Every structure is written in C-alpha cells, then in structure tokens.
Amino acid sequence: KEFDHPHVAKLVILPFMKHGDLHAFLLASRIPLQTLVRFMVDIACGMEYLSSRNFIHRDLAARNCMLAEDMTVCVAVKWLALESLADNLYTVHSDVWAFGVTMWEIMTRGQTPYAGIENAEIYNYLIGGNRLKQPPECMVYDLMYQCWSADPKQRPSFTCLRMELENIL
Ligand SMILES: COc1ccccc1CNc1ncc(C(=O)NCCCN2CCCC2=O)c(NC2CCCC2)n1
C-alpha cells in the first residue's frame, strides 16, 4: 500500500483530516448540486487509480471517504452488489456498485440507504428489480443507477464514471 494519488488517502499512521469523513460531514450539514458532484469526481479519480493497480476496495462508502482542509475528498450489506451478497464475489464491478450507493448518500446528504429495510431483505428486495429511489430533487440519478445493473459487465468503469461526472459542468 505505497499508493500515491491526491484522491487516495496517504499512508504516513494516517494524515489528520480537519473536516472529518464525508458521511459525518454531509450529516453535519443536514442536521449545492455543484459541490456534491465535485465530491463524486474526486472519489471517482481516487477509485480509477486504485482499480488501475488492481486494488479491489470492498467497502467503499461515504463514511470511508475523507475531506482534507482544501476540501478535496480522498478515498480511505447496504453497499454490496448482488453478486457480492449471493456469491461473495468482489471485483471492480462491485466496487462500482458501492460508488453508486455513495453517489446516493451524497445526494441524500448521508441517509442510510434503504432506510426502512432490514439488512436481511435487501437481496430479496434487489432481485425484485428494485433500487434506491431518485431522491426528492436530484438531476445524476441515471449514472448511479447504471452502477447497480444486475449484470456487472454493464456497470460503467471508474474512468467512464469520472468523465460523465466531470462532463456534467
Ligand atoms: C479513518 O482514518 C483515516 C483514513 C484516511 C485518512 C485519515 C484518516 C484518519 N485521520 C483523521 N483525521 C481527522 C479526523 C477527524 O475526526 N477530524 C475532525 C472532524 C470533525 N468534523 C465532523 C463533521 C465536520 C467536522 O469538522 C478523523 N476522524 C475519523 C474518521 C471517521 C471518524 C473518525 N480521522
């Protein structure tokens, strides 16, 4: 883990991050569409770097992304792909799933995905063709929705995700 990218947490023994994790942060602010999308580009650059080095993360979520003082985000069952729950299969494609849900957390400013649903009924709930809902006023919903295709080969790579997100400006 001698990785070095500005959207991947350095190994120093971790740096001190003035503004906390992105989850607690987004939660402080609830209790603009333009700052949230920048959050998403960051995590996507971070994730592009890791998967290029064939590092499979396995626990991507807002809680595990960190805001530095400059306010860039760096990357450090409710997030798990169909195939990770059913077959304990973890890949770039399930990491892409998790990002999808992180994209949703951001847009809900830190809501527990599938809030009124138990851990145990998410699978059943996901094979039903059901996904996380488009949050009240959200443009973006389409990209995160691709990230949760049943066929992991239809989920867009982190390079595509970043571009669709960078593009959206
Ligand atoms: C999780 O560990 C890390 C991973 C990657 C880089 C750095 C670290 C650890 N560094 C670090 N530095 C400052 C903090 C830290 O707490 N900073 C103060 C943040 C307080 N908040 C929360 C809402 C707004 C605010 O300013 C921290 N917190 C851990 C992470 C999640 C909960 C507790 N952690």
Indicate which residue's Cα is closest to atom 9 of ligand 1.
Answer: 14
HEC secondary structure over the chain? CCCCCCCECCCCCCCCCCCCEHHHHHHHHHCCHHHHHHHHHHHHHHHHHHHHCCCCCCCCCHHHEEECCCCCEEECCCCCCHHHHHHCCCCHHHHHHHHHHHHHHHHCCCCCCCCCCCHHHHHHHHHCCCCCCCCCCCCCHHHHHHCCCCCHHHCCCHHHHHHHHHHCC
- Residue 42 burial (CB count, 10 A): 22
Nearest ligand 1 atom, CA 15: 7
What lies within 8 Å, CB to CB, of 33 at 6+ separation is 139, 140
- Check if 14 has its Cβ closer than 6 Å to any atom of ligand 1: yes
Indicate which residue's Cα is closest to atom 23 of ligand 1.
Answer: 25
Provide the token pair at 33: 């569409």
Provide the token pair at 56: 């499979």
Domains in the chain and their CATH numbers?
A: 1-169 (1.10.510.10)
Provide the token pair at 54: 């064939």
- DSSP β-bridge partners for residue 66: 21, 74
Contact between residue 115 and residue 55 where contact means Cβ atoms under 8 Å apart: no
Nearest ligand 1 atom, CA 63: 31
Instruction: Tell me whether residue 87 is one of the annotated catalytic residues.
Output: no
Q: How was this structure determined?
A: X-ray
Ligand 1: distance of its center to the CA of 103 in Å?
20
- Check if 68 has its Cβ closer than 6 Å to any atom of ligand 1: no
CA 89 to chain centre: 18
Ligand 1: distance of its center to the CA of 16 in Å?
7
Indicate which residue's Cα is closest to atom 15 of ligand 1.
Answer: 20
Reported resolution, Å? 2.4
Provide the token pair at 113: 């995905």
Provide the token pair at 95: 């990491």
